[PDB]
Amino acid sequence: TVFRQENVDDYYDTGEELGSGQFAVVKKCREKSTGLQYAAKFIKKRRTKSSRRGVSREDIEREVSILKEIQHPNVITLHEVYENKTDVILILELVAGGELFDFLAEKLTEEEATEFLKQILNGVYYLHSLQIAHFDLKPENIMLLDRNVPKPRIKIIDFGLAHKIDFGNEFKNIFGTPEFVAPEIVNYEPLGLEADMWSIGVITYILLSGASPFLGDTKQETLANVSAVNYEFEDEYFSNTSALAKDFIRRLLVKDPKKRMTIQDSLQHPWIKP
Template sequence: MSPEEKPPPPQAGRCRGARPPQPQPQAQPRRGGLLSEIRTAIRSEPFHLRYRLSPGRELGRGKFAVVKKCIQKDTEKEFAAKFMRKRRKGQDCRMEIIHEIAVLELAQCNLWVINLHEVYETATEMILVLEYAAGGEIFDQCVAEREEAFKEKDVKRLMKQILEGVSFLHRNNVVHLDLKPQNILLTSKSPLGDIKIVDFGLSRIMKSSEELREIMGTPEYVAPEILSYDPISTATDMWSIGVLAYVMLTGISPFLGDDKQETFLNISQMNVSYSGEDFDLISESAVDFIKTLLVKKPEERATAEESLQHPWLEQSDEPISRAWNESAGGESSNVTQQDADSASEKSVDVEKTEEEESIVTEELIVVASYTLGQCRQSEKEKATEQKAISKRFKFEEPLLQEIPGEFIY
């Protein structure tokens, strides 16, 4: 069974205390690239009747939402509950949450997108009960010390999954617009699991008959066309994937400055480096992959499908998913042996350099954490660039306000 053929969960029907599902089976876009129709029944009974929150730290937090681990009482199954405020900055944002639900429904057949289980609504918030990804954010491995950080072979496998998920979204006219390490989760931390794309709060539906221009995204991951207020397209996501690949391979955020203005200037002027100690163990093919995405003109960037055919990813001898050979249950266990065989047939045997050989023999230790840390650096950098290093990965919150003109070049 391929990632796009994951059997959809049973449709939520009428249930006690639940609002009936919307009558229209196919959600249609409304103005601003938002979807307004959903199939999922919205439950109005108290959330705590069926779920209990797990003690401990939150899984994630933003300005208007918090994610907590919860347990379904009758099954003891783990889920992630996303509590989202309906009123934000004095405005009713319920329809934006409905749009996020609709996108999750649209992607429910894709293995690389987080699965939506149930939806609850109270007077002040909506609660999305989502698949639980036990491995946490890939951000934690991006900022880990070199010994514990991603190896290039790990990045290859995870990047294939990210691209397959994004390719599915793009074929369905969905742009994510906030792809970053905090929004890519792992199904397990050790052994290193598979990815799940989350947080579709900024996503939009692209229509060929309309142009979409918005200032949104997370500063260090936004594409040049966002800053110049040019039309958004699927290529906008591909820029973010280029930044993401750079970060996963090196632990460095390529455009991040001391403040937003410097970050935007770096993006607009394409101030990016592909040399130095951080690239000592990175293959030339990996660097070329990044360069096909960090291209200023959107029409010249590689698409998700083209990126999947890049030689760097074609060289991988890893199966596309670990899920097929894991004994534990869960959503990812639906991937069959046939997928693994198919992925192996597509792999190309290549000679590894001495550096790559040394990477392969190292043990990967994944540390689960939801707090920010310094990105990894050399001893020399620790001594000479402490101030600059401490500012890396500073921006977490999406950019929702208009950018002053002096930032645009």
């Protein structure tokens, strides 16, 4: 699939950089024709078939295909795609309140945690309903619309590892951030929607305590901890956290993906359900 090959600069002006990573940079931008504002993600293309630099066309096209399917208040939306020799440029919905990660570093109560979590669960319910696994859920990939409100609204971003799961599972080169990946990722096993639910358990633990449940001193330690389900609720952090909140986490941080709560289970769980 090919994208718009006119110069993006003829249609958009860029401004503040919103973030950067491995082979991508995200810039605030404004469409010249409408004055409307967006986030432009510049993704570096591979220059040869065997290069390890840049993102493969196959991987770029998958991400764009997934983004085009999505329309839900809790997930980022895609406006347009451009490309040139060096980059694919995604013109994405602008979200200005920063990462949930940075909002967290600034300070949650169970109410504040569930307020965020319900939105995340709603977005993931939408995705999983469409058989889309995100595969990279973490606080860095949850953005706030406006961070100066008591209960900020959120949108899930970064579908770079996302996959359609038409056959119950996928087994591919898929591996996210060690702190948040499920044991089946660590062990290179077939992956399905269940992996996202584990990641939600990790996010929930962090929301409530400020601490990361499997984090070791090195990446290999973290991964070893994940595979062994080596976590516990520290009393210093969880002493005034409800047993029901702990129950919710405990039913997500389960090694056997078949025994893990599904997204539907999570919405019916007594900590979440009205």
